[PDB]
Automatic annotation (TrEMBL), chains A, B:
Its EC number is 3.5.-.-. Binds 2 divalent metal cations per subunit. Zn(2+) 2 binds at residues 143, 176, 204. PANTHER family: PHOSPHOTRIESTERASE-RELATED, PHOSPHOTRIESTERASE-RELATED PROTEIN. The lineage of its organism: Bacteria, Bacillati, Bacillota, Bacilli, Bacillales. Belongs to the metallo-dependent hydrolases superfamily. Phosphotriesterase family. This is Phosphotriesterase. Keywords: Hydrolase, Metal-binding, Zinc. Fe(3+) 1 binds at residues 21, 23, 143, 264. Mn(2+) binds at residues 143, 176, 204, 264. It is an enzyme of class 3 (hydrolase). It holds the Pfam family PTE. The keyword Zinc applies. It comes from Geobacillus kaustophilus (strain HTA426).
Amino acid sequence: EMVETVCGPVPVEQLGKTLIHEHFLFGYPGFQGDVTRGTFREDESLRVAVEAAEKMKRHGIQTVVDPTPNDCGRNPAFLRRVAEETGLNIICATGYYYEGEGAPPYFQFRRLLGTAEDDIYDMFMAELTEGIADTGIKAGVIKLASSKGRITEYEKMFFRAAARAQKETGAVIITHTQEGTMGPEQAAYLLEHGADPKKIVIGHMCGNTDPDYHRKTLAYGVYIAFDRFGIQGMVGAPTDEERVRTLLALLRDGYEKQIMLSHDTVNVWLGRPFTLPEPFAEMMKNWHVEHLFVNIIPALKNEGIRDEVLEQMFIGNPAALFS
Amino acid sequence: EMVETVCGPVPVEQLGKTLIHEHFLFGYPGFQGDVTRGTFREDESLRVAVEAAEKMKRHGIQTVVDPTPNDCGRNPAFLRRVAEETGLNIICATGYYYEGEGAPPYFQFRRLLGTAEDDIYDMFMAELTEGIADTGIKAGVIKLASSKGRITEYEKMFFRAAARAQKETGAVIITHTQEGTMGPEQAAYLLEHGADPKKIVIGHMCGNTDPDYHRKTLAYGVYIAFDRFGIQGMVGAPTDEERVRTLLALLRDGYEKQIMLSHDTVNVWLGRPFTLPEPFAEMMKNWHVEHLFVNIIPALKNEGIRDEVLEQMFIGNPAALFS
Ligand SMILES: [Fe+3]
Ligand SMILES: [Fe+3]
Ligand SMILES: [O-]
Ligand SMILES: [O-]
Ligand SMILES: [Zn+2]
Ligand SMILES: [Zn+2]
């Protein structure tokens, strides 16, 4: 009946229209070391974040899952400020990034000590049931991530710890797949360790344009997310045109109750400001929190997708997921 | 004539007896993500650090270089507190750890943007000549590090940025070599890019037990450090007995003016507390800041090493290095 948001427990029935995957803040591991030229401008960042939140509210969004990994600048206290200000529900995560772009040296060390998996489990349990540092904010989801073409042994420690923690807490698991790979593998591995498919979201599934890969992942009974609308050119990404074509094939096949949509936006980048070169920038020009509503949804409607299906995805699915 | 310490500029002539490589705080990249169970206990940590500082002072140490990488928990403000308390000079660094155990994803990303080398350079220049964040503390050395058997392209950006910055500032460069490899390569690569051998310390040279490897590194005119006394079995390290044998061979060959000594201790570990499993842990039992003075130095003296040579290493070499 309840889910933990950054402002405390909230009835699942009150979540309403939800974006399953967006980042208010995000930094690549190592951004901390660039503190002198890349310092965190709090007031400006909160402005940007609050504005992003208001744009979502304007399209009827009431809830956001922000699955920023512990090692990528996750900041629950900041999230709580964004939420207090806007009345938005924000659910945060506990978890580490994938080994390739995460910060593995620390838990790799604890693996040599032979305590890693249990320490990770302990960390999950603590942040889900007690609180994150001294914020007294609890995570509402566990965040897992795998590398391209592989779930590494480092990554598997997290997967195994997450299944254990989900068995103990009933927590929702949300994943990152890298460049359209390992969806089926992720679902299978989690299920083999007793994870509950109705509590799992395989993320970045839109990274793969082959509907059979999707059906293979969907066969496990898990949710899948097309959560990178707007992202074009970078991190191996397909086009929105392909995202839509794939999504339409699935919806037409009756998979609406297993699909959620989002953009994976990064509203404030941690570390030093940067600008993409307009080979990529203009390809990435619709990567913002309104893109789904302004561009994608109308396109789906013009292809015969009905309001009931849209509602299933944005409202009914998150409610079922968290309950 | 001056060098930047955490308490401001200091006459090089006043540095006195110096440990070239010790860490008051250190954490493996990713420690930040374990904040809930691994929170930073400031008061206790400052105690431990101040004590470590006093033990060094008691053995006549006046200056310590703490070359903790930016991405491994470097905390200049904390260092400044340790120094204010004890009167010890502490010189800190600017630099990132090696790829394999650092946090590469951030500057790897800026490489794709094609600005990495210049941003790193910009960071060096800023921390050496302006200050680190808002602490107003400037780094006195640039820290570089390479992987086992290789200096990676990621690492080479830092090496190239450091040569540039040293040409502009005359800053001292101090390196990490991984498991006794790349000493000669590091010196060659830095020299090829116009770095000054008399301002370079190739570190962890004690990781290799073959004197010809050492002579090859020493031929570039650089300093080397045997800076891991007390560390045994772990990270591929040899024994102190081997460290001593190798060091004796070099001193007997007249290399005293190019060698410095330290322990590479980690006085406070960042992230969650741990204990090394008991067979490794006893191997590592003398890994503490008094080991050199209580155990190693008397052994060198019993092998005929004179006071003048010891003084050359602990006092004369640091003076020449920083001037
Ligand atoms: Fe994401
Ligand atoms: Fe070190
Ligand atoms: O992501
Ligand atoms: O080190
Ligand atoms: Zn992701
Ligand atoms: Zn080192």
